[PDB]
Every structure is written in C-alpha cells, then in structure tokens.
C-alpha cells in the first residue's frame, strides 16, 4: 500500500512533534466541593483526592472515587477535594 | 469526500494506536510542605491535593487553591500535599 | 507539494480534535493499600496522597514518597492512599 504507507509515515512524523508539545501543556485542576451533612460529591469528570469533615471528625471514607462520606454521628459538613486533568493548561 | 474520509480514518487509527505510548511518560509527582502553625502553602506550579493537621484535627480548608488551613484551636503544625504533572526523563 | 501540504493540514486539524477528546478519557485513579503493622507502600508508577493508621493512631509520615509509616507504638494496620493517571475508555 505505497500511498497508505507514505501517508502513514507522514502522520507518524507529525504526531512525533504534536504529542510532546500538547502533553507538556496538560495541567491539573483541583477544587473543593463542600456540603452540609455527611456526604460531599465530586463532579462527573473528576476524582476524589481527599476529604475533610467538620466538628474535627477524623473518620471518613471515599465511595467509588466520587463521594466523601464523613462517618461521625454528629457531622455538620463534609468536603471533597476533586481533581481532573485540564488540556492546554 | 471519499479520499478525505479514508485519510481521516487513517489519522484516527494511527492516533488511537500511538496515543498510549505517547502519554506513558506523564505522571503525578507529589511532595509535602509542612509548617509550624495553622497554614502550609504549596509552591507556584503545583496543586493542593490534600491537607493534614497536627494533633487530632480532621477539619481543614484550602485558601485560594494554594494554602492548607487547619481549623481546630491550637494546632501545632500543618502539612499540604502538593502535586504536579511531570513528563519523562 | 500541494497534496503533502493538504494532508499535513488535515493531520494537524484532526490532531486538535482528537487530542482533547483523548485526554477526557484519562482520570486520576486512586486506591488504598492496607498492610498489617506500621508500613504500607504504594506501588511503582503511583504517588502517595496520604496515610491512615486506624482509630487508634493519627501520627504518620511518608518515606521516600512511597511508604506510609504510622508512628504510634501499637499499630494493627497501616493504609496508604495511592494515585496514578489511568485511561478509561
Ligand atoms: Cl497545547
Ligand atoms: Cl474509592
Ligand atoms: Cl503561563
Ligand atoms: Cl509524547
Ligand atoms: Cl512559590
Ligand atoms: Cl493564607
Ligand atoms: Cl508539510
Ligand atoms: Cl522501621
Ligand atoms: Cl511526610
Ligand atoms: Cl480504556
Ligand atoms: Cl475504545
């Protein structure tokens, strides 16, 4: 496939320059979602990196990389730290 | 545009083929910044992914997406987990 | 090269569409490593986000950006939270 082969070669040549430059421009975008009560959910497109709880509650867990659950009986607020990759910054 | 479409298809196949190896060298690099008192700041160029508090405090928040703040009274030390994306050697 | 040039343009245009969509399939993937005793290690290719020591202990540190170390005298289990970039789809 001499034409396919020549085009394939060109694509690969172009990609060898395009990939590194694009990849180095990816950034990390993190925010906190806090909510009253015992749960705080990260938006679709992000994962939970860490949680914080009101009332100095130090007992929490993460449900399926999406929801922070503060486990103490009396809990006023729950916060999830949510992160995603960000193209071109 | 049967020829354009054939080439578009090939570019897409090559992209999907080549993408995994292109992205293999990006990764998450983390370290900890610890400070006496209630605040620990992450350096410019990094994101705050987690905070930890001296002595029995689960309650923290992040200021300006940069500074871990431990909320409980009388905290001795604060630590921020600061991370960035890093490519390759 | 009118044809080479036209194809080069199409590769670059296509790349600008494909790349952001490809990164949208990449997420931070985090999980817990739990080990008996005072140490829990994240595997090569992951970053340590944080540690825990159970409801007994709240004092820990990260060694070599790889190993969670619980510091109190009696520790049943140590847990490390480990994160990497992973493609999903
Ligand atoms: Cl870019
Ligand atoms: Cl999880
Ligand atoms: Cl800039
Ligand atoms: Cl690359
Ligand atoms: Cl700085
Ligand atoms: Cl501040
Ligand atoms: Cl060209
Ligand atoms: Cl030891
Ligand atoms: Cl540490
Ligand atoms: Cl996949
Ligand atoms: Cl697929």
Q: Which residues of B touch A20 (CB under 8 A)?
A: 22, 87
Q: Which residue is listed with tokens 């140490």?
A: C39
Flag if B15 and C14 touch (Cβ within 8 Å). Answer: yes
The residue among A13, A50, A53, A85 with the most chain B CBs within 10 A of its CB, best to mutate, is A50
Flag if C8 and A7 touch (Cβ within 8 Å). Answer: no
Q: Which residues of B touch A15 (CB under 8 A)?
A: 14-15, 18, 22
Beta strands in B1-89 (DSSP E): 26-36, 39-41, 47-53, 60-63, 67-70, 77-87
Judge whether A81 and A49 are in contact, CB under 8 Å. yes
In what helix (H) or strand (E) does residue C37 lie, and over which residues does it extend? none
Flag if B87 and A59 touch (Cβ within 8 Å). Answer: no
Flag if A18 and C19 touch (Cβ within 8 Å). Answer: yes
* Residue C53 backbone zone (phi > 0: left; psi -120 to 50: alpha; other: beta): alpha
Q: Which residues of A touch B57 (CB under 8 A)?
A: 56, 58
Beta bridge pairs of residue A72: none
This PDB structure is determined at a resolution in Å of 2.0
Name which of C38, C31, C33 is nearest C53 in CA terms.
Answer: C38
So where are chain B's domains?
A: 1-25, 26-89
CA-CA distance, A78 to A24, in Å (whole number)? Answer: 34
Q: No. of H helices and E strands in chain C?
A: 1, 6
CATH number for the domain running over A1-25: 6.10.250.200
Ligand 5 centre distance from Cα of residue C86 (Å): 29
Name which of C30, A46, C37, A60 is nearest B30 in CA terms.
Answer: C30
Tally of CB atoms within 10 A around C61: 14
Tally of CB atoms within 10 A around C83: 24
- Report in angstroms the alpha-carbon separations of B80 from A26, B51, C14, C28, C59: 22, 5, 40, 19, 15
Judge whether C11 and A14 are in contact, CB under 8 Å. yes
Q: What is the DSSP letter of B38?
A: S
- Token representation of residue C86: 């992973």
CATH classification for the domain delimited by C26-89, as one of 2.60.40.4230, 3.40.1500.10, 2.60.40.420, 3.20.20.190:
2.60.40.4230
- Token representation of residue C67: 């190993």
CA-CA distance, C5 to C23, in Å (whole number)? Answer: 27
- How many cross-chain Cβ pairs, A to C, lie less than 8 Å apart? 50
Judge whether A82 and A33 are in contact, CB under 8 Å. yes
**Which pairs with CB-CB distance under 8 Å and at least 24 residues apart come from B32-36?**
B32/B79, B32/B80, B32/B81, B32/B82, B32/C62, B33/B79, B33/B80, B33/B82, B34/B77, B34/B78, B34/B79, B34/B80, B35/B77, B35/B78, B35/B79, B36/B76, B36/B77
Please state whether beta strands B26-36 and B77-87 pair in parallel, antiparallel, or not at all (unpaired): antiparallel
Judge whether B31 and B82 are in contact, CB under 8 Å. yes
CA-CA distance, C23 to C30, in Å (whole number)? Answer: 17
Judge whether B75 and B84 are in contact, CB under 8 Å. no
Judge whether A78 and A51 are in contact, CB under 8 Å. yes
A residues 52-81 closer than 8 Å to C (CB): 58-59, 62, 65
């Amino acid at each position: 496939c001499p034409i396919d082969e020549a085009i394939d070669k060109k694509i690969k040549q172009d990609f060898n320059s395009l990939f590194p430059n694009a990849i180095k421009n990816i950034g990390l975008n993190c925010w906190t979602v806090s909510s009253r009560g015992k749960l705080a959910s990260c938006p679709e497109g992000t994962a939970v990196l860490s949680c914080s709880c009101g009332s100095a509650c130090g007992s929490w867990d993460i449900r399926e990389e999406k929801v922070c659950h503060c486990q103490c009986a009396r809990i006023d607020w729950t916060a999830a730290r949510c992160c995603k990759l960000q193209v071109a910054s």
